[PDB]
Each structure stands twice: as structure tokens, then as C-alpha cells.
Amino acid sequence: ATLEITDIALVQPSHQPLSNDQTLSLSHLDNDNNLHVSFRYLRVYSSSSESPSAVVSASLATALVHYYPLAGSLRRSASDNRFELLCSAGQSVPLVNATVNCTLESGFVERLVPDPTREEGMVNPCILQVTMFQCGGWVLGASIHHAICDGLGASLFFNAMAELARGATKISIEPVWDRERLLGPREKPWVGAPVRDFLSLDKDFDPYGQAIGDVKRDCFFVTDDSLDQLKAQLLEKSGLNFTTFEALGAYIWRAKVRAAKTEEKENVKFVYSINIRRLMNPPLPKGYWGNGCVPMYAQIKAGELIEQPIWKTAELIKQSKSNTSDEYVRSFIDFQELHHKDGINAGTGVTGFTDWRYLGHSTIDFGWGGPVTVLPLSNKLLGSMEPCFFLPYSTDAAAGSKKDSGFKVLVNLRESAMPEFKEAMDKFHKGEFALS
Amino acid sequence: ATLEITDIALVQPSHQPLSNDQTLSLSHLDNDNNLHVSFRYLRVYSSESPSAVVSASLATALVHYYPLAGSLRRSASDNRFELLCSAGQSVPLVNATVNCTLESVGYLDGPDPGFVERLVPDPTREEGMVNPCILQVTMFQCGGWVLGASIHHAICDGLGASLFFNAMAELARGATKISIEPVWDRERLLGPREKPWVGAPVRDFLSLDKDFDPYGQAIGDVKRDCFFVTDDSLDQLKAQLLEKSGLNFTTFEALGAYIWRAKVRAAKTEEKENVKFVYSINIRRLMNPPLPKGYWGNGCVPMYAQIKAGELIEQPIWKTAELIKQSKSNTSDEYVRSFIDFQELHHKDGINAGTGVTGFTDWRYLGHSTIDFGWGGPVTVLPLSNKLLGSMEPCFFLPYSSKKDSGFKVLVNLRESAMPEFKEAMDKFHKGEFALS
Ligand SMILES: [Ca+2]
Ligand SMILES: [Ca+2]
């Protein structure tokens, strides 16, 4: 199957917002070395019948009046090498227009969004692609440098585009910058034990350059039935209540570390991102589209994770959220202020988890409805080379039987570990959870 | 205007990667006799000095890409090249000025103002082996500049060269380390099979003649010209082909067919002469297992469509477009392995695709814009080499600098006697007079 790039549109703001150049500063959350990555993902749309490309391009043009920094260039500052965003009149967001001879089925998927290096993504930190499928339907791909925004910030931007596409006269929320005012370090930096216990310094360590072999991607459908069984059996054995994220998180984390044959005394970490916009005092505004999340962690020696009961692991994950506070965030920022040059990292053995089940995927509607499927292609996230995603429920899941209902889990895992991991997921599917 | 050379810097790696000498083996893809050419390419930038920035980034890039500083020589057992690297080797950087503005010329996107050839070194045969990588920075009197490169095609393909230039550019932008570490391993990854075997796809394309020089044919002097083609006119052509044939063609297929026909027509190629449409495809991701990400050696193979000239010039464009489309069907792991094993079996026997080969290269959607040393991506890119793909008349699709005005550039190399008819063909194309049938 041949994907043909018909053209690349350089889409400028409808009305140029700048006189002369502006250099925007980024926050210490934005400048985290673990966010120096392009994040690549796509949305699949059902109907193709003006064209999706015409609608997306015109709406991008209008949105860029307020969101013009996405048209900018990331560069290192003159002083501390942290990134800033150079904005100037004439800059654009590239929209790649493509067409393939295929069916949405929802190797080749890699060609649906551009794949810049972290350094290349500095030059072009927001690239979109509209790919038309001959058989019906289309894909919106996005490659966004993670320093510019988190998922919530990208959702503000895309929702602004989408509401304009649906005929809004103006965007309903003015995007806020103010990044240094809102998330700048304290005058006397202070870093508490919860952040210090998590992070270490090593100028010689690249979290995304570890020699673990080729990282493979696989997808597993996990049934609601299986998860109800897991949670009920954990309750019967422990007296304790666990969420899907805690229980399935624990099972996958154990399986992966077991499958990788991690040394017994290696410290391993379960890491996830939490939105702190409303947690800060004072809170970040709704229109704050920069990174407004911090990583939270649970940590344990690998030998203990692989042989302790799942209810203990699930309880560690549950209890991780208790570190989430205004101070945790301030501590995290202050640590970046003190040690950005010193190679801040969470070490080897980090498994990142991202839960996309409970987000408003469906408001990103350009006229063809909400996406039928959403897929992240990136495998470098949260200081992990092996991140896991819980993907949203499809509409077919709510239309179908209870015993058919479930969601896909996308796993990134080193090739050598994948055979055993697949076996662990097959046992899961069979309800052979081996909980203790 | 007048171009003058101010000095020539010999840039060594910032830190010596070599204590001990080494001879690097090249692949059978690298040692293909059609790749015995210095590939010459220039990037134009509007605007410490560019020369300073380029020079330092080169020096740091050579820590990892030091074989570009080495010398090609023939091995002791066969006439195949190997690469001698040793401490002290350097990449020459030519520093130059020209006394006119980039603005005054087309940002070199119009006709040659008379010095375009002097913007990139043009090494002789022996010079290009001694110095298989040479750069040049030419400053224009109003501050803009051109980066020229002469790189021996045996060392790398376009994707390899792009790896290298992107390494220089990201270091110039203050990277703390390069994004992709380059991988050698050429012998192990792209060496021949112990029992060489060559399939019909490769055999049907290639022949043996120790007496034939694909780049020394007596066709007259080859000229270069450029044509702007609008996205509109391609849409029209594709819609007409679909209407008449029931087949959807890519731009490369449709425009490829049109240009190929027009060229063979204009050359008055004899009726029963076999003519070929040849292009290079990247096989890094096709191989089983795939080549690694930083494989910067040649990782492409030539694909072909062939047909008699008499049939090409009189059959419908849609038939020709289908021929080009169908040529991708040969692209497989075994096609590559067949190609490599043929080079093993017959390197000394003058492997060739014969007369009447027209090469096509589609460089529209390379990552041109990331080759940014701090003055932005290049405003104009220009290949000057015209000995490619066993053709003396290669054609490039290149990016250009409203929907009615949107498009790209076509750079054509064509013998002088055939240029006037070919010009009339591209004018008809521009007016939507495609004469398809
Ligand atoms: Ca610590
Ligand atoms: Ca033959």
C-alpha cells in the first residue's frame, strides 16, 4: 500500500499577530529534559464526504492568530541552554496532505505523522498531517514537541481549531502564556524529600538512549469482565479496593519487569503524569496550555515487585497519589532550577503509564464527528523507553454486550521481553492472574 | 559578479576518534560503478559568522562521521574501494565571497548568473577519492550565504548525507549530543550471500559490458534547466488519467511518464531501442531484518521500468504511468539481496542498465528545513551533478521556495539538441495541453 504526499501547506496565522519578533520563555515544567521529545499521535475519522484538509487548514490558520507560538522555533537561550520559543512574522505550521489506497482498519501507520528527532522537532515543533483513505475516512496526525504543551494544552488548541471548523465566530477561551510568572522557581529554591527520593543527577545518563534492544509495540484488548474479576479477587484476598489503573497497572508492571529479567536489587519505578492546574495555590488558569502536569511515582526493588502479591503493588500505586501537592510541584520546579545542567533523571527501570480512557476525545470534531480511534506512536515518554497507554473505549464497546466491553492497552517493550509479556497477557485474558 | 576564495580550512575532528589506523570495508551497494561520482549539492541561506558555525559543527560532527575525512583506494585483491582512516585526516572547508546580493540573483532559483558551478568544488576523479568530502561556504556581499558540498557517492546516499548534515546542524544549534549515532557495519549488513543467487527482476534490468561507460556516451553537451509545475495542473492530469484509464496515479507516476515520453521523443531515440526509467528507493526499512536507524552508507537500490522507445513515444501516458507504478512491485528484500549478489559475481564485468536510461529523483519531501545552522532552513537547494543512476540526463523534483500558484520545481538535465522540443513539451504541460493518448 502506497502513501502519496500530494503537498505540504505552510499555514500562517489568518491575521499576522506580531509586529516584530517575540522570544517567549518556557516554564521549568516545559524545560524538563524528559519532555525533549516529539510526541506523535493520530485521530481516525469515519467519513470523508469541503474536504477535511480544507477545513483543518482554514481552522489552523484562524486558531494560529491566538496560538501563533506553535508556528515558532525552539532554541537554546544565550545563558543557560534551556529552551525558549522564537516567534516571528511569516512563520507557519506545516500541514502534510497525503492519500493512501487502503481501508481504515484503525509499520505503515508510522507514515501517518512525521517523525522528527528531538533536535529536528525544535525547528518544526508542530507538524500536522491529513491523510485521506481511498476506501473512506481520514487521519489527523500531529507531531508536537513536548516542551510546548502537555496533552491538555494540545486539546485546548485542537478544540479551538474544531470549534472554528464547526462555524464559531471566535475561539471560546483565550490561551494564556505567562509561563515564567505562573510556574517560575522560588527566590530561594527548596526541594522536599518526595521529589529528592524520586530523582537523581547523572550528566552521563540519557533516559531515552538506554541499550535495551529494539523496542516493539503491541496491542492487547482488555475486557471489563476480566478487570471486574481482578478487582473482586484482590478485594477477597486483601479487603482492599483498587481502581483499574491501580490493579491493571500493577499486573502489567510486574509482568514487564519479570519479562525483562531485571536484576533483583535494581530499583524500578511506575511513573504517571497528573494535571496540577487546579492543585496549585493559586491555580493555573483554564487557558494555560503549557505543560501543567508533574510525574508521580511508585518505586520498589525489582525482586520485590516480581514476587510480592499484586495487592501490595496495587496499594503502592494507590498510595503514590498522596505525594501530589502544591509543594510537590514547587519542589519539582525548584529542583529543575538547581540542577537542569546536572542531568536530572529517575534512573533505569522506569515504566511510564498513560491513561487516555477518561478524556473528551470526541469534542475534537471538525464536521465528520468525533474520532473513532486515537493512537500514540511515541515510545519515549515519562523518562521511559517502554511506556504503556490505556486507550479510550470505542463507541462499539458501549453498543455491545457487557462480556465484549473493554479497551486496548498499547505496550512498548524491548523485543527480548515481548514473548513472555504476551504470555502474561494471555493468562490475564484467561483470568489466571497468579496474584500472590 | 565574481566569486573569489578567501582561504581553505582543513577541519579535523574536535577530539581525535582514532589512535590507530583503520581500513573500512564498503558495501556492494557503495561499490556499484554507477556511484563512482562526486555528488555536488548546494543550500542557499538568507541572513559568529556562518563559516565559523559550519566549521566548528563540522569538527564536532567528524568525531562520529570521521570516515568522511578518509581516502578511498582500490583494495589489494579486487578493484573495489575501501576507506583508509587515520589521525590527522581532515575535511576541506573552502571559504569564498561573491560581490553581489543573493537578491540580485534568483536566490539562485533562476538562470545561472555565471558562477553557480564555482559554489561547490568540482574534484577530479583522483581528487574526489583523496578528498571524498569537501564543503564550501560562500558569503554574498549583503550577508546571505551558500553551503556547497562535494561528497563521493560511494560513502553515502542522500539519506546518509542528510544524517550527517542534520548532525552538524543540531550541534550548531547547541545540541549536547547528536540525535542518531551513525552505524558502519557495512560488510556484515549489506555483504553478499555465501552462495550468491540473483533473481529474474535484477537480471532482466542489468547486463554486462566491460567496454561501456554509462557516463561517457556521445550525446552532445548536457544542459540544465528548471520548470515550475503547479499542484493544479497535476490535479488536472491525474483526473484526466483516472477518467480515461480508471487508475489513480501518484504525481511521480503521472509527471514521470509525461517527462520521460517528452525526453525520449525530443532525443529522437531509435524505434526499437530499449529505454529505461530509473529511480532509487530506500530499502533500510524493507530488509529482513531492517538496517539500523544511523545506517548512513548507501541504503538504496535502483528500480526500473523498461520499454521500447517507439512504444513509449506513441502509447498513452496512462499506460506509461502504469508501467512506472508496476515497477515498485519488484521492491523486496530478495531484490536487494539479488542486486548485492550480482555485484559480488560481476563487479569486474561492467554491470550496467545500458543506453537510454533516464533517472528521476524525487526530493520534494526530504527534511530540507532542519538543516538550520541558526540562519533558518535553506531558501533554495540545487543539485549540480548530472551523472546519476546510470543516466547522463537525470531529472529532480525539488521543493519550491494561493492554490492557483502552489507547486514545486523540476530540474531537468538534457542534451542540448533535445532541449528546444523538451521546452515546448513543458510549455504544453503548463497550458494543460497534455496530449495524453
Ligand atoms: Ca535522589
Ligand atoms: Ca540481463
Author numbering:
A (entry chain A): 2 to 50, 56 to 112, 122 to 451
B (entry chain B): 2 to 48, 56 to 409, 416 to 451
Quote the original article.
In coumarin biosynthesis, a BAHD acyltransferase-family enzyme COSY was recently discovered to accelerate coumarin formation as the only known BAHD enzyme to catalyze an intramolecular acyl transfer reaction. To understand the mechanistic basis for the unconventional activity of COSY as a BAHD-family enzyme, we present several crystal structures of A. thaliana COSY (AtCOSY) in its apo and various ligand-bound forms.
To investigate the molecular basis for the unique catalytic activity of COSY, we first obtained the apo structure of AtCOSY at 1.9 Å resolution. Additionally, we observed a single Ca2+ ion that binds to the linker loop region and is coordinated by the main-chain carbonyl oxygens of Arg211 and Leu214 residues. Nevertheless, we observed no significant difference in coumarin synthase activity whether or not Ca2+ is present in the assay buffer.
